[PDB]
Structure 1
Amino acid sequence: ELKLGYKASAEQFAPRELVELAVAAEAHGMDSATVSDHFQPWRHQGGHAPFSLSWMTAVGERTNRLLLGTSVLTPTFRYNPAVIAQAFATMGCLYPNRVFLGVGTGEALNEIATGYEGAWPEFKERFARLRESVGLMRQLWSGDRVDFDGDYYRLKGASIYDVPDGGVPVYIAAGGPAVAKYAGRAGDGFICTSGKGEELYTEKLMPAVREGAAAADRSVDGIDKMIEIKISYDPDPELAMNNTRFWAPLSLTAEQKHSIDDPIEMEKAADALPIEQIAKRWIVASDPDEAVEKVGQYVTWGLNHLVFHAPGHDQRRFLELFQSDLAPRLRR
């Protein structure tokens, strides 16, 4: 149940680097690697956005053991859920038992630039589109002919011809209680991120997951409880704090992060923050016991799949540090 993984940051690295880093994750003992799914990075200057599905396939072909998936992909606006279904069914066939689809309700930054017409929908409709799309994708993963007449999406006699016998597991990202309950009800997996305060995890997210599971008569023990642990570990404490600079946009409000449609405007807002405000969001440590105590909290709070997001450009260095300094402590 306890798994240790690596977050491959498409917002920060070009395609070949993003793939090699994930390969290095396996070399260094990681159980999983997850890739963000962006059309546009958070920053204009020095941002990247390699296509997530190409990363998954290239990494799958180069690895033997890593569990691979999106953290996370929005299957509802720029993407056609039927094509996403095909894509993941195909990767499920290529890399058996090694693929998951992580899903999210979306961010304007990926969607408005890519041609979505009119106003960025309110939360109710984005949440509503996500539930429906998950329905449709799973109906397709059955491998049977599908007639689907939803409020957002249609299918008439569609089949996925190549799909693994048990389909494709779905992990659901939630920043609040409403989607977390949905994840407890409907997800094979639950995704959240660290550093937003204990109350969020203990009082809102985990009770909502548990209550969703209860609502659908499910064992909560059966849901993979995954978190992206924002960690900046370096024996040089000056480097540990400074390394967080690139990730300044993640320190903006949820509202700014999901409604700002332009990287230029995003980066403007984000570079108003001093480094010591940005570091609020990150586990900043240069002692490994200090580091693992802080990571240990999430475990205590009910998360079992720990996906490590290190902020610096030197990812190979984080991975060496992780394998020698943190992994032995974290595994117990």
Structure 2
Amino acid sequence: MAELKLGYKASAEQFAPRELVELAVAAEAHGMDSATVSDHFQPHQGGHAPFSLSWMTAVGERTNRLLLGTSVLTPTFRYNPAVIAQAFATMGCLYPNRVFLGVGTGEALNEIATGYEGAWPEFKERFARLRESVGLMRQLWSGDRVDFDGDYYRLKGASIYDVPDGGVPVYIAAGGPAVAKYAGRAGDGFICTSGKGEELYTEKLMPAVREGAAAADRSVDGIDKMIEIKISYDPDPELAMNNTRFWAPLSLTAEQKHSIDDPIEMEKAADALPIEQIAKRWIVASDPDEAVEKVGQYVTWGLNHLVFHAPGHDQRRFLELFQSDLAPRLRR
């Protein structure tokens, strides 16, 4: 649903497994409503990739209220969607009403590295694979026996024996109108990322979600509209600026992010970015009122679940500042 939530982005790219879990526990301690993790097989310099589903489970077992999920996981290539259905159904049983599945169309880098053969599929196929996998998983979460024969995936007499009462809510990530519309039509949730220009949110994404919801005769209000807020808020401006540097890959173009299959190629192109250009993606701020005004814009544009990704290694510092300075304002 579309009440205001404030959550925390746990960056698997930046931290080792134990630290990544403990940070999410600190996020609960600091009042966050949710925590979400990137799902990567590999991020190199100061790089990490703890297994996302182990992070979800460890934090679940250590926490009481956080909604937990992926932002996002590709359920279409290295991961068998039936096994993903089983994994998240299990987690859903273990942490009732606290689990979601965040899905995307995929990145060449994860999939080529783990053994994908032949040409990296074009966007259209990655989208069709995504749609087909989501329906496959949903049929499985009914808890009945499923026979499935799609263009891409198959099941023969398959059941998930252990299914949560509230099902497994599916959040669909989009950087463009096409998948946003699919999200409005079919998603329990919708995910985007901040910093990419007022136009993308108001002119492409939000109207696409409304279009999809309308098209499928759905209340737009019942879709959780989630966004990862790229915020570099620190009373120390040097840190606010300098903390963004680690995150240069996020400032590469959409096609470099999805299609570069070589991690050497990827780090080169990230390294090529001047910090001033990196920073444009981020809310760089030393004043808490100004920071919240920038975030508040997304709430005006129709987003209701705001998940804060802070760029620096000192995440506990971020959480302290979030709790004392940002959250009271953000709540309103």
> Take 1:51 and 1:259, find their aligned partners in 2: how far apart are those partners?
22
Q: CA deviation at 1:263?
A: 2.4
Q: CA deviation at 1:3?
A: 0.1
> Take 1:13 and 1:109, find their aligned partners in 2: how far apart are those partners?
19
Q: CA deviation at 1:275?
A: 1.0
Higher deviation after alignment, 157-166 or 283-292: 157-166
Partner secondary structure for residue 231 of structure 2: strand
Q: CA deviation at 1:103?
A: 0.2
Output one character per residue of 1:256-281: Cα deviation in whole Å (capped at 9) or x when no partner.
Answer: 11111222221111111111111000
> Take 1:149 and 1:263, find their aligned partners in 2: how far apart are those partners?
35
Instruction: Find out whether 1:129 has 2:129 as its counterpart.
Output: yes
Output one character per residue of 1:141-161: Cα deviation in whole Å (capped at 9) or x when no partner.
Answer: 000000111110001110000
Q: Retained in 1: the 8 A contact 2:97–2:166?
A: no
Partner secondary structure for residue 12 of structure 1: coil
> Take 1:46 and 1:82, find their aligned partners in 2: how far apart are those partners?
33
> Take 2:253 and 2:10, find their aligned partners in 1: how far apart are those partners?
23
> Take 2:166 and 2:236, find their aligned partners in 1: how far apart are those partners?
47
Higher deviation after alignment, 269-278 or 217-226: 269-278
Partner secondary structure for residue 281 of structure 1: coil
Partner secondary structure for residue 180 of structure 2: helix
Q: Retained in 1: the 8 A contact 2:7–2:33?
A: yes
Q: Retained in 1: the 8 A contact 2:99–2:169?
A: yes
Partner secondary structure for residue 308 of structure 1: strand
Higher deviation after alignment, 142-151 or 262-271: 262-271
Q: CA deviation at 1:124?
A: 0.7
> Take 1:27 and 1:319, find their aligned partners in 2: how far apart are those partners?
9
> Take 1:288 and 1:109, find their aligned partners in 2: how far apart are those partners?
37
Partner secondary structure for residue 280 of structure 2: helix
Partner secondary structure for residue 76 of structure 1: coil
Q: Retained in 1: the 8 A contact 2:190–2:223?
A: yes
Q: Retained in 1: the 8 A contact 2:99–2:168?
A: yes
Q: Retained in 1: the 8 A contact 2:23–2:316?
A: yes
In structure 2, the gaps of 5 or more residues are none
Question: Structure 1: which 4+ aligned runs deviate by more than 6 Å?
Answer: none
**Which residue of structure 2 lines up, in the alignment, with residue 296 of structure 1?**
296
**Which residue of structure 1 lines up, in the alignment, with residue 219 of structure 2?**
219
Output one character per residue of 1:174-210: Cα deviation in whole Å (capped at 9) or x when no partner.
Answer: 0100000000000000000000000000000000000
> Take 1:122 and 1:33, find their aligned partners in 2: how far apart are those partners?
31
> Take 2:227 and 2:83, find their aligned partners in 1: how far apart are those partners?
27
> Take 1:53 and 1:119, find their aligned partners in 2: how far apart are those partners?
28
Output one character per residue of 1:108-147: Cα deviation in whole Å (capped at 9) or x when no partner.
Answer: 1111111111000001100000000000000000000001
Q: CA deviation at 1:238?
A: 1.0
> Take 1:300 and 1:50, find their aligned partners in 2: how far apart are those partners?
35
> Take 1:223 and 1:267, find their aligned partners in 2: how far apart are those partners?
36
> Take 1:6 and 1:262, find their aligned partners in 2: how far apart are those partners?
29
Q: CA deviation at 1:84?
A: 0.2
Q: CA deviation at 1:166?
A: 2.9
> Take 2:33 and 2:303, find their aligned partners in 1: how far apart are those partners?
15
Output one character per residue of 1:278-319: Cα deviation in whole Å (capped at 9) or x when no partner.
Answer: 100000000000100000000000000000000000000000
Partner secondary structure for residue 230 of structure 1: strand
> Take 2:263 and 2:51, find their aligned partners in 1: how far apart are those partners?
17
Partner secondary structure for residue 229 of structure 1: strand
Higher deviation after alignment, 277-286 or 162-171: 162-171
> Take 1:147 and 1:200, find their aligned partners in 2: how far apart are those partners?
39
> Take 2:177 and 2:145, find their aligned partners in 1: how far apart are those partners?
35
Output one character per residue of 1:60-119: Cα deviation in whole Å (capped at 9) or x when no partner.
Answer: 000000000000000000100000000000000000000000000001111111111100
Superposition pairs of residues 298-317 of structure 1, within 5 angstroms:
298-317=298-317
Q: Retained in 1: the 8 A contact 2:25–2:62?
A: yes
> Take 1:234 and 1:29, find their aligned partners in 2: how far apart are those partners?
19
In structure 1, the gaps of 5 or more residues are none
Q: CA deviation at 1:167?
A: 1.3
Aligned-residue RMSD, C-alpha: 0.6
**Which residue of structure 1 lines up, in the alignment, with residue 207 of structure 2?**
207
Q: Retained in 1: the 8 A contact 2:171–2:190?
A: yes
Fraction of identical pairs, as percent:
100
Q: CA deviation at 1:45?
A: 1.4
Q: CA deviation at 1:165?
A: 2.2
Aligned length: 330
> Take 2:268 and 2:289, find their aligned partners in 1: how far apart are those partners?
36
> Take 1:259 and 1:235, find their aligned partners in 2: how far apart are those partners?
37
> Take 2:111 and 2:160, find their aligned partners in 1: how far apart are those partners?
26
Higher deviation after alignment, 186-195 or 162-171: 162-171
> Take 2:55 and 2:264, find their aligned partners in 1: how far apart are those partners?
25
